[PDB]
Amino acid sequence: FLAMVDNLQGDSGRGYYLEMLIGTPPQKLQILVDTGSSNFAVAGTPHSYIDTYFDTERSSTYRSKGFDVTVKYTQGSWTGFVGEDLVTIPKGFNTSFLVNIATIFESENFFLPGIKWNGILGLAYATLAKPSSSLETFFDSLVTQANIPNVFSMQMCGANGGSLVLGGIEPSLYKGDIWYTPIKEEWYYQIEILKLEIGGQSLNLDCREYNADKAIVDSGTTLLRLPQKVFDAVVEAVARASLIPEFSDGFWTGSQLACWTNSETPWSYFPKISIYLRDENSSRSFRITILPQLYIQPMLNYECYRFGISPSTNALVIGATVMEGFYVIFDRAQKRVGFAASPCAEIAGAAVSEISGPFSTEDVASNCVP
C-alpha cells in the first residue's frame, strides 16, 4: 500500500481528490473521494469552476447504457448519462478495471466555486446507488476485479494532501490503537453516537438526538454537521466554556469570520469537543476528540477564522472538520469503522485531535438509533 501514501491532493475546501485515468486513450481527471455517496459521477461537458471533463466520444472503450441518472438533494441536483468504461488509478494499481460512469451534463449547487475536482468517487454502499442499487459501485467493481480486501482507509492532512488506501490499512499512517465502532446500516457509513462532550461537560440530550435520522462518516461533506437542536447545544456549551468576550451570532452560523492579530491565536481559550462512539462490545465506548484548531478554521496583517461546525436537518455528518484529525478505516468486510489519531494532524507542533478509551455505556440506552 506504500504506492497509495500521499495519493490525495487538496484540503477541506478544495476537497481531497485522487488522480483517475478513464477510457482509451486514458483522460486524466481529478476525482473527489466521497464516502457519503455511491456513484462514480464525472463532468461530461465543459462548465464554470472546472478545466477538464471526460469526453466519452474520445474513448474507444466507452459503452453507453442508454439511460440517465437524476439526483435531487437539498442544496441542489445532478443529472448525467450512465455508461461503462475502463479506469486506472495510477497511485495504486497497474491494471485497468471496467466500471460504471455517470457523465454529468446538467446540475445545481454541484460544481461550487473553488473546487479542483471534476468528478466524484462515491465509496458508500450499493443501497445509495442511483438509479438503483443494481448499478455496481466503483469499489464493488475494484474489490472483485483487483482482488483486494473489502476495506479502504483514508487519511486527510489539510489541517497539501492525504491518502486513500484501497484494500487495507497502512501502518505508517497511524500510531496508537485503532478503535472500531459498528456500522449500523450499510448505506451511508452510519455509526452510533452515544454522547457529545464540550470542555469536559456532556450536553444534557437523549442520545437519540445525535442519531435521528442518522450519524454518518462522510469525506464528501466539509464541516461537522449537527441536527439543529444538537448544533444549538454545541454552540451554547462552546460559548459558555469560552469565558472571553463572545463571538458574533454571525460567526456561529457561517455568516461572519472572527479575526486576531496574526500573533495572539484564538486556540488557547476554546474547548475540546469529544464525540463518544459505541465500541464492538456494547458495554464500552471510545471518544474521538478535536481541539479548537480543527473546528476554528483559518481562511496580510490579520489571520481569520470560520466556525467549522454547521447545522443540518435529518443527519449528524462527521465530515472533513473531524476526519482531518484521524486515520479513518472503512472496514466494510467486518461491518465497522475504525479511527486512529493522525500523525499528520498537527499544527505548530501540537496534535489537534485525540482518541481515547474505553468508557462505560451503563448510563446510555442499549440502542441510540430510533
Partner: nanobody, 113 residues
C-alpha cells in the same frame, strides 16, 4: 433490485479438458449489468477470472486464463457463460458470478490428474 444468480456446469475433468459454465440471472436488468466471474479454491486467495460489460463487446481476463477461457453473455436469455479450455490442475476451485455486490452460490471445477 433483488440481483438473484445461479451458476451451473462445473464438474471433474482431466488436464487438457474443458467445461462450459453458465449463470442464470433474475431480479434485475441483466442487459444493463457488468458481469463478473471470480474463483475461490480452498486455502487460497480469491481470484478474479473475467469481466464483461453489459452489451458484451467489452471483455477483460486475468493473465492466468488469457486465451484459455472465454466469457460471453446472452441478454435475451439473462444468461452469462464461461467457456474454459486447456484446463490445468491450478484451475481447480469454486467459480462464481458477481454483480453489484451480490453473487450466486457457485459451481465446482476440479481438474484432477
Amino acid at each position: 433490485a433483488q440481483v438473484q444468480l445461479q451458476e451451473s456446469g462445473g464438474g471433474l475433468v482431466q488436464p487438457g479438458g474443458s467445461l462450459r459454465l453458465s449463470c442464470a440471472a433474475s431480479g434485475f436488468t441483466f442487459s444493463s449489468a457488468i458481469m463478473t466471474w471470480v474463483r475461490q479454491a480452498p486455502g487460497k486467495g480469491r481470484e478474479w477470472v473475467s469481466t464483461i460489460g453489459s452489451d458484451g463487446s467489452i471483455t477483460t481476463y486475468a493473465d492466468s486464463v488469457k486465451g484459455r477461457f472465454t466469457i460471453s453473455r446472452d441478454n435475451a436469455r439473462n444468461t452469462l457463460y464461461l467457456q474454459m479450455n486447456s484446463l490445468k490442475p491450478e484451475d481447480t476451485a469454486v467459480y462464481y458470478c458477481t454483480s453489484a455486490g451480490r453473487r450466486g452460490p457457485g459451481t465446482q471445477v476440479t481438474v484432477s490428474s
